Design a protein around this ligand. Structure first.
Ligand SMILES: *[C@@H]1O[C@H](CO)[C@@H](O)[C@H](O)[C@H]1NC(C)=O
Lengths: 213, 198
């Protein structure tokens, strides 16, 4: 069926160039324009540009004039097409989710979207997190601090504890690394009795700590 | 060309209307946290295939309405309208539940982290509704007004509440000088601000 598969998350250094990809399949591709959109965290969508799949002709927003390149490579039988968005001279501003979307009609209704690619522009380089405890109905948690890049996963008692757990979304610091928190609530009684163990994994750096609280 | 309001709360079974100021071939999209948009209505009022009939749009002269009948829990999302390259900022929609005061906690810095030169103090606002809350940091009655970040969970799909953490970050040095640390938070379900201290 009609589908747009995008490449996975990219990390980029300031001043460098990043390439996002979209693979179209499942329909008459020559007959519909592909657009790129993007979404900064806590922001609306902004249009980047479009590309004509027959001619290869692109057009983009003036904000990106001279630093974005939309290109196309078709398959032989035309059953599949790859679409690229190359962004060069990247800035802080360029950190966002980038979506590809298929234009259905001549009037810009977008009925099929790719899933999005995260593009993080950052000075830093891969780093495992430092996990510190949030010590004590009662609350307790783990502060998972200064890691890179995202993501990390947090469990309690190896997935054996799930109810009452809140794992917060990561925030970005003046440092340029990310910190989040995982908290869980428990009755004041169960602390002497029960063993509570934050269990963090940050596979891109191959870290996997278990912390008692 | 704006959209109103910026946040809506509704009960299940209710009808909700979102209004767009825009002009042209106008399209409405639903977007779920962390996910791609989904076309609901195109061309002002045509309903996209596979979308439930409880969605409709009508052309209100210069402006356009989106309507959701018999609102449902899957309707919790952000809605926006688009005309060619132009997007209107959007409306968060969440489920209405009884007002619930925040459960507040404060965690001093671990001694383990101080060994690294940085001090983190955390406030936790647990399970409250509606989403709107404000946190402020007091220590020795000094009110800090830089050096703080805040993270908020999504409306919980079990009990319809929100949780919030504010992290105040310090050097090991400044942490030592002052001694007594406090979080103060204000919420609809609290008649007067509450503070936790260490
Ligand atoms: C659209 O919504 C507004 C309120 O948001 C309502 O008062 C108005 O009657 C609606 N307009 C139309 C086209 O019925």
């Amino acid at each position: 069926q009609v589908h747009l598969s995008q490449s996975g998350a990219a990390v980029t250094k300031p001043g460098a160039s990043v390439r996002v990809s979209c693979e179209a399949s499942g329909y008459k591709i020559s007959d519909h324009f592909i657009h790129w959109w993007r979404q900064a965290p806590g922001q609306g969508l902004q249009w980047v540009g479009w590309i004509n799949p027959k001619t290869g002709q692109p057009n983009n927003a003036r904000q990106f004039q001279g630093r974005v390149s939309l290109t196309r490579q078709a398959s032989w039988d035309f059953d599949t097409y790859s679409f690229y968005m190359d962004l060069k001279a990247v800035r802080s501003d360029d950190t966002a989710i980038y979506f590809c979307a298929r234009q259905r009609s001549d009037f810009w209704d977008f009925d099929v979207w790719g899933s999005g690619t995260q593009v993080t522009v950052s000075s830093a380089s891969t780093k495992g997190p430092s996990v510190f405890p949030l010590a004590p109905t009662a609350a307790l948690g783990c502060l998972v601090k200064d890691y890179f890049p995202e993501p990390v996963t947090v469990s309690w008692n190896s997935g054996a504890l799930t109810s009452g757990v809140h794992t917060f979304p990561a925030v970005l610091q003046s440092s340029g690394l990310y910190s989040l928190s995982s908290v869980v609530t428990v009755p004041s009684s169960s602390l002497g009795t029960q063993t509570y163990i934050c269990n963090v994994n940050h596979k891109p750096s191959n870290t996997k700590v278990d912390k008692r609280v | 060309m704006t959209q109103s309001p910026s946040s809506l709360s509704a009960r299940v079974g209710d009808t909700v209307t979102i209004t767009c100021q825009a002009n042209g071939y106008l399209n409405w999209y639903q977007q779920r946290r962390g996910k791609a948009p989904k076309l609901l209505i195109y061309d002002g009022s045509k309903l996209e295939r596979g979308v439930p009939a409880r969605f409709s749009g009508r052309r209100w002269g210069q402006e356009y309405n989106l309507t959701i009948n018999n609102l449902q829990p899957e309707d919790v999302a952000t809605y926006f309208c688009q005309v060619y390259e132009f997007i209107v900022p959007g409306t968060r929609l969440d489920l209405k539940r009884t007002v619930a005061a925040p459960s507040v906690f404060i965690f001093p810095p671990s001694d383990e982290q101080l060994k690294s030169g940085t001090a983190s103090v955390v406030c936790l606002l647990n399970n409250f509704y509606p989403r709107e809350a404000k946190v402020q940091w007091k220590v020795d009655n000094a009110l800090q007004s830089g050096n703080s970040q805040e993270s908020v969970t999504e409306q919980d799909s079990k009990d319809s509440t929100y949780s919030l953490s504010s992290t105040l970050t310090l050097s090991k040095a400044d942490y030592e000088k002052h001694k007594v640390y406090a979080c103060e938070v204000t919420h609809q379900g609290l008649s007067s601000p509450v503070t936790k201290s260490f």
